[PDB]
Amino acid sequence: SSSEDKITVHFINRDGETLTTKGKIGDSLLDVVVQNNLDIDGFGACEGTLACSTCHLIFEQHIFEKLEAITDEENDMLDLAYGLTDRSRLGCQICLTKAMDNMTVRVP
Ligand code: FES
């Protein structure tokens, strides 16, 4: 008698594993991971304020193209990203969307 929302998010460890964490259209990257005890030692640190450059993640196909755009500043911080794929960018921002229902990501 109020409301309820929660999506599913998957994170492929840099080792090749796969973590499962449910977000919630409106949440905020990092928080979810941090909420999962961040099982990806290396993820963002600065909270996503652009002062760590230890973030950057890979988005699932058809997902990255859905994700919102980014500025030039963040674009720079998205450079540090390793093996910048065709769907890799700096995360720890924006909020989950219905287009993220079971969104899979990878940790390069
Ligand atoms: S969390 Fe430090 S820039 Fe993304």
mmCIF file with all atom_site columns, C-alpha atoms and ligand atoms in Angstrom:
data_model
loop_
_atom_site.group_PDB
_atom_site.id
_atom_site.type_symbol
_atom_site.label_atom_id
_atom_site.label_alt_id
_atom_site.label_comp_id
_atom_site.label_asym_id
_atom_site.label_entity_id
_atom_site.label_seq_id
_atom_site.pdbx_PDB_ins_code
_atom_site.Cartn_x
_atom_site.Cartn_y
_atom_site.Cartn_z
_atom_site.occupancy
_atom_site.B_iso_or_equiv
_atom_site.pdbx_formal_charge
_atom_site.auth_seq_id
_atom_site.auth_comp_id
_atom_site.auth_asym_id
_atom_site.auth_atom_id
_atom_site.pdbx_PDB_model_num
ATOM   1   C  CA  . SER A 1 1   ? 0.000  0.000   0.000   1.00 0.00 ? 1   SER A CA  1
ATOM   2   C  CA  . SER A 1 2   ? 2.698  2.427   -1.077  1.00 0.00 ? 2   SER A CA  1
ATOM   3   C  CA  . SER A 1 3   ? 5.075  1.289   -3.794  1.00 0.00 ? 3   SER A CA  1
ATOM   4   C  CA  . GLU A 1 4   ? 7.900  -1.061  -4.699  1.00 0.00 ? 4   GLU A CA  1
ATOM   5   C  CA  . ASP A 1 5   ? 10.602 -1.293  -7.340  1.00 0.00 ? 5   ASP A CA  1
ATOM   6   C  CA  . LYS A 1 6   ? 13.821 -3.231  -7.796  1.00 0.00 ? 6   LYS A CA  1
ATOM   7   C  CA  . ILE A 1 7   ? 15.752 -4.469  -10.807 1.00 0.00 ? 7   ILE A CA  1
ATOM   8   C  CA  . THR A 1 8   ? 18.540 -6.990  -11.247 1.00 0.00 ? 8   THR A CA  1
ATOM   9   C  CA  . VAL A 1 9   ? 22.165 -6.154  -11.948 1.00 0.00 ? 9   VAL A CA  1
ATOM   10  C  CA  . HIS A 1 10  ? 25.019 -8.502  -12.763 1.00 0.00 ? 10  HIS A CA  1
ATOM   11  C  CA  . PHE A 1 11  ? 28.717 -7.784  -12.402 1.00 0.00 ? 11  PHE A CA  1
ATOM   12  C  CA  . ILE A 1 12  ? 31.382 -9.886  -14.076 1.00 0.00 ? 12  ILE A CA  1
ATOM   13  C  CA  . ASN A 1 13  ? 34.426 -9.896  -11.829 1.00 0.00 ? 13  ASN A CA  1
ATOM   14  C  CA  . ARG A 1 14  ? 37.758 -9.083  -13.431 1.00 0.00 ? 14  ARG A CA  1
ATOM   15  C  CA  . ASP A 1 15  ? 38.602 -12.721 -12.817 1.00 0.00 ? 15  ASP A CA  1
ATOM   16  C  CA  . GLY A 1 16  ? 35.706 -13.890 -14.953 1.00 0.00 ? 16  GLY A CA  1
ATOM   17  C  CA  . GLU A 1 17  ? 33.156 -14.482 -12.218 1.00 0.00 ? 17  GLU A CA  1
ATOM   18  C  CA  . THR A 1 18  ? 29.655 -13.047 -12.117 1.00 0.00 ? 18  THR A CA  1
ATOM   19  C  CA  . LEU A 1 19  ? 28.035 -11.199 -9.238  1.00 0.00 ? 19  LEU A CA  1
ATOM   20  C  CA  . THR A 1 20  ? 24.302 -10.695 -8.877  1.00 0.00 ? 20  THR A CA  1
ATOM   21  C  CA  . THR A 1 21  ? 22.876 -7.573  -7.282  1.00 0.00 ? 21  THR A CA  1
ATOM   22  C  CA  . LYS A 1 22  ? 19.405 -6.077  -7.486  1.00 0.00 ? 22  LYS A CA  1
ATOM   23  C  CA  . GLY A 1 23  ? 19.309 -2.311  -7.849  1.00 0.00 ? 23  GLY A CA  1
ATOM   24  C  CA  . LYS A 1 24  ? 16.173 -0.213  -8.162  1.00 0.00 ? 24  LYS A CA  1
ATOM   25  C  CA  . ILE A 1 25  ? 15.326 2.218   -10.937 1.00 0.00 ? 25  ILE A CA  1
ATOM   26  C  CA  . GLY A 1 26  ? 16.441 5.340   -9.111  1.00 0.00 ? 26  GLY A CA  1
ATOM   27  C  CA  . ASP A 1 27  ? 19.338 3.919   -7.132  1.00 0.00 ? 27  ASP A CA  1
ATOM   28  C  CA  . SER A 1 28  ? 22.916 4.957   -7.795  1.00 0.00 ? 28  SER A CA  1
ATOM   29  C  CA  . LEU A 1 29  ? 25.846 2.913   -9.046  1.00 0.00 ? 29  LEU A CA  1
ATOM   30  C  CA  . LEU A 1 30  ? 28.462 2.150   -6.420  1.00 0.00 ? 30  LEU A CA  1
ATOM   31  C  CA  . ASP A 1 31  ? 25.829 2.171   -3.702  1.00 0.00 ? 31  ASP A CA  1
ATOM   32  C  CA  . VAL A 1 32  ? 24.611 -1.187  -4.951  1.00 0.00 ? 32  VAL A CA  1
ATOM   33  C  CA  . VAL A 1 33  ? 28.119 -2.601  -5.075  1.00 0.00 ? 33  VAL A CA  1
ATOM   34  C  CA  . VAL A 1 34  ? 29.005 -1.033  -1.746  1.00 0.00 ? 34  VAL A CA  1
ATOM   35  C  CA  . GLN A 1 35  ? 25.772 -2.551  -0.492  1.00 0.00 ? 35  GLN A CA  1
ATOM   36  C  CA  . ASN A 1 36  ? 27.060 -5.911  -1.663  1.00 0.00 ? 36  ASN A CA  1
ATOM   37  C  CA  . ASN A 1 37  ? 30.250 -5.376  0.303   1.00 0.00 ? 37  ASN A CA  1
ATOM   38  C  CA  . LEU A 1 38  ? 31.875 -4.394  -2.971  1.00 0.00 ? 38  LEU A CA  1
ATOM   39  C  CA  . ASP A 1 39  ? 33.175 -7.789  -4.021  1.00 0.00 ? 39  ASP A CA  1
ATOM   40  C  CA  . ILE A 1 40  ? 35.179 -6.090  -6.745  1.00 0.00 ? 40  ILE A CA  1
ATOM   41  C  CA  . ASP A 1 41  ? 38.166 -4.662  -4.909  1.00 0.00 ? 41  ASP A CA  1
ATOM   42  C  CA  . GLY A 1 42  ? 39.041 -1.864  -7.302  1.00 0.00 ? 42  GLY A CA  1
ATOM   43  C  CA  . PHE A 1 43  ? 35.664 -0.318  -8.030  1.00 0.00 ? 43  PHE A CA  1
ATOM   44  C  CA  . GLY A 1 44  ? 35.084 3.393   -7.558  1.00 0.00 ? 44  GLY A CA  1
ATOM   45  C  CA  . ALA A 1 45  ? 36.367 4.963   -4.362  1.00 0.00 ? 45  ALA A CA  1
ATOM   46  C  CA  . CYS A 1 46  ? 35.668 8.692   -4.636  1.00 0.00 ? 46  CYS A CA  1
ATOM   47  C  CA  . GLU A 1 47  ? 31.961 7.873   -4.581  1.00 0.00 ? 47  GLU A CA  1
ATOM   48  C  CA  . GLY A 1 48  ? 31.878 8.811   -8.248  1.00 0.00 ? 48  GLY A CA  1
ATOM   49  C  CA  . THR A 1 49  ? 32.746 12.469  -7.819  1.00 0.00 ? 49  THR A CA  1
ATOM   50  C  CA  . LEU A 1 50  ? 35.617 12.133  -10.263 1.00 0.00 ? 50  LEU A CA  1
ATOM   51  C  CA  . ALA A 1 51  ? 38.681 11.787  -8.067  1.00 0.00 ? 51  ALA A CA  1
ATOM   52  C  CA  . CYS A 1 52  ? 39.578 8.111   -8.160  1.00 0.00 ? 52  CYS A CA  1
ATOM   53  C  CA  . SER A 1 53  ? 39.555 7.037   -11.789 1.00 0.00 ? 53  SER A CA  1
ATOM   54  C  CA  . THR A 1 54  ? 39.383 3.557   -10.312 1.00 0.00 ? 54  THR A CA  1
ATOM   55  C  CA  . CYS A 1 55  ? 35.835 3.069   -11.539 1.00 0.00 ? 55  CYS A CA  1
ATOM   56  C  CA  . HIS A 1 56  ? 34.796 2.551   -15.141 1.00 0.00 ? 56  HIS A CA  1
ATOM   57  C  CA  . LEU A 1 57  ? 32.816 -0.577  -15.928 1.00 0.00 ? 57  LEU A CA  1
ATOM   58  C  CA  . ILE A 1 58  ? 31.486 -2.469  -18.925 1.00 0.00 ? 58  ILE A CA  1
ATOM   59  C  CA  . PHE A 1 59  ? 27.810 -2.400  -19.822 1.00 0.00 ? 59  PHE A CA  1
ATOM   60  C  CA  . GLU A 1 60  ? 25.759 -5.130  -21.453 1.00 0.00 ? 60  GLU A CA  1
ATOM   61  C  CA  . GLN A 1 61  ? 24.951 -4.963  -25.146 1.00 0.00 ? 61  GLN A CA  1
ATOM   62  C  CA  . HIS A 1 62  ? 21.974 -2.785  -25.990 1.00 0.00 ? 62  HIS A CA  1
ATOM   63  C  CA  . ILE A 1 63  ? 22.362 -1.336  -22.515 1.00 0.00 ? 63  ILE A CA  1
ATOM   64  C  CA  . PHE A 1 64  ? 25.286 1.007   -23.044 1.00 0.00 ? 64  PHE A CA  1
ATOM   65  C  CA  . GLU A 1 65  ? 23.491 2.508   -26.020 1.00 0.00 ? 65  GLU A CA  1
ATOM   66  C  CA  . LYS A 1 66  ? 20.602 3.082   -23.642 1.00 0.00 ? 66  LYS A CA  1
ATOM   67  C  CA  . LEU A 1 67  ? 22.644 4.619   -20.850 1.00 0.00 ? 67  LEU A CA  1
ATOM   68  C  CA  . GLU A 1 68  ? 22.618 8.405   -20.825 1.00 0.00 ? 68  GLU A CA  1
ATOM   69  C  CA  . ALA A 1 69  ? 25.395 10.431  -22.407 1.00 0.00 ? 69  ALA A CA  1
ATOM   70  C  CA  . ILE A 1 70  ? 28.335 11.942  -20.563 1.00 0.00 ? 70  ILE A CA  1
ATOM   71  C  CA  . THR A 1 71  ? 30.130 15.273  -20.464 1.00 0.00 ? 71  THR A CA  1
ATOM   72  C  CA  . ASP A 1 72  ? 33.688 16.037  -21.504 1.00 0.00 ? 72  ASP A CA  1
ATOM   73  C  CA  . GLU A 1 73  ? 34.967 16.101  -17.942 1.00 0.00 ? 73  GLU A CA  1
ATOM   74  C  CA  . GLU A 1 74  ? 33.671 12.627  -17.185 1.00 0.00 ? 74  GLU A CA  1
ATOM   75  C  CA  . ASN A 1 75  ? 34.749 11.571  -20.656 1.00 0.00 ? 75  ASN A CA  1
ATOM   76  C  CA  . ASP A 1 76  ? 38.303 12.298  -19.576 1.00 0.00 ? 76  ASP A CA  1
ATOM   77  C  CA  . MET A 1 77  ? 37.889 10.238  -16.428 1.00 0.00 ? 77  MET A CA  1
ATOM   78  C  CA  . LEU A 1 78  ? 36.390 7.549   -18.632 1.00 0.00 ? 78  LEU A CA  1
ATOM   79  C  CA  . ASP A 1 79  ? 39.632 7.441   -20.581 1.00 0.00 ? 79  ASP A CA  1
ATOM   80  C  CA  . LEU A 1 80  ? 41.687 5.975   -17.762 1.00 0.00 ? 80  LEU A CA  1
ATOM   81  C  CA  . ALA A 1 81  ? 39.349 3.045   -18.277 1.00 0.00 ? 81  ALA A CA  1
ATOM   82  C  CA  . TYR A 1 82  ? 41.216 -0.061  -19.374 1.00 0.00 ? 82  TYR A CA  1
ATOM   83  C  CA  . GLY A 1 83  ? 40.665 -1.679  -22.750 1.00 0.00 ? 83  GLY A CA  1
ATOM   84  C  CA  . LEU A 1 84  ? 37.889 0.842   -23.255 1.00 0.00 ? 84  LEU A CA  1
ATOM   85  C  CA  . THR A 1 85  ? 35.378 -1.299  -25.108 1.00 0.00 ? 85  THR A CA  1
ATOM   86  C  CA  . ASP A 1 86  ? 32.649 -0.122  -27.452 1.00 0.00 ? 86  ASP A CA  1
ATOM   87  C  CA  . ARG A 1 87  ? 30.289 -0.098  -24.492 1.00 0.00 ? 87  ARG A CA  1
ATOM   88  C  CA  . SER A 1 88  ? 32.589 0.870   -21.647 1.00 0.00 ? 88  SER A CA  1
ATOM   89  C  CA  . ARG A 1 89  ? 32.301 4.126   -19.738 1.00 0.00 ? 89  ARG A CA  1
ATOM   90  C  CA  . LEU A 1 90  ? 32.647 5.734   -16.330 1.00 0.00 ? 90  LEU A CA  1
ATOM   91  C  CA  . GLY A 1 91  ? 29.847 4.598   -14.050 1.00 0.00 ? 91  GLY A CA  1
ATOM   92  C  CA  . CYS A 1 92  ? 29.134 5.425   -10.427 1.00 0.00 ? 92  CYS A CA  1
ATOM   93  C  CA  . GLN A 1 93  ? 26.576 7.932   -11.650 1.00 0.00 ? 93  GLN A CA  1
ATOM   94  C  CA  . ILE A 1 94  ? 23.054 8.380   -12.962 1.00 0.00 ? 94  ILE A CA  1
ATOM   95  C  CA  . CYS A 1 95  ? 20.469 5.921   -11.700 1.00 0.00 ? 95  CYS A CA  1
ATOM   96  C  CA  . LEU A 1 96  ? 19.260 2.490   -12.745 1.00 0.00 ? 96  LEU A CA  1
ATOM   97  C  CA  . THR A 1 97  ? 16.498 2.366   -15.331 1.00 0.00 ? 97  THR A CA  1
ATOM   98  C  CA  . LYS A 1 98  ? 13.816 -0.060  -16.445 1.00 0.00 ? 98  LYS A CA  1
ATOM   99  C  CA  . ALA A 1 99  ? 16.180 -0.684  -19.336 1.00 0.00 ? 99  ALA A CA  1
ATOM   100 C  CA  . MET A 1 100 ? 18.561 -2.134  -16.777 1.00 0.00 ? 100 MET A CA  1
ATOM   101 C  CA  . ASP A 1 101 ? 16.290 -4.990  -15.772 1.00 0.00 ? 101 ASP A CA  1
ATOM   102 C  CA  . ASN A 1 102 ? 18.962 -7.622  -15.267 1.00 0.00 ? 102 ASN A CA  1
ATOM   103 C  CA  . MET A 1 103 ? 21.723 -5.395  -16.589 1.00 0.00 ? 103 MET A CA  1
ATOM   104 C  CA  . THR A 1 104 ? 25.034 -7.214  -16.814 1.00 0.00 ? 104 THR A CA  1
ATOM   105 C  CA  . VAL A 1 105 ? 28.377 -5.493  -16.377 1.00 0.00 ? 105 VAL A CA  1
ATOM   106 C  CA  . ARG A 1 106 ? 32.039 -6.446  -16.336 1.00 0.00 ? 106 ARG A CA  1
ATOM   107 C  CA  . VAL A 1 107 ? 34.996 -5.300  -14.271 1.00 0.00 ? 107 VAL A CA  1
ATOM   108 C  CA  . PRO A 1 108 ? 38.025 -4.817  -16.531 1.00 0.00 ? 108 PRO A CA  1
HETATM 109 S  S1  . FES B 2 .   ? 33.762 6.437   -8.399  1.00 0.00 ? 1   FES B S1  1
HETATM 110 FE FE1 . FES B 2 .   ? 35.782 7.684   -8.444  1.00 0.00 ? 1   FES B FE1 1
HETATM 111 S  S2  . FES B 2 .   ? 35.299 8.551   -10.670 1.00 0.00 ? 1   FES B S2  1
HETATM 112 FE FE2 . FES B 2 .   ? 33.787 6.995   -10.495 1.00 0.00 ? 1   FES B FE2 1
#
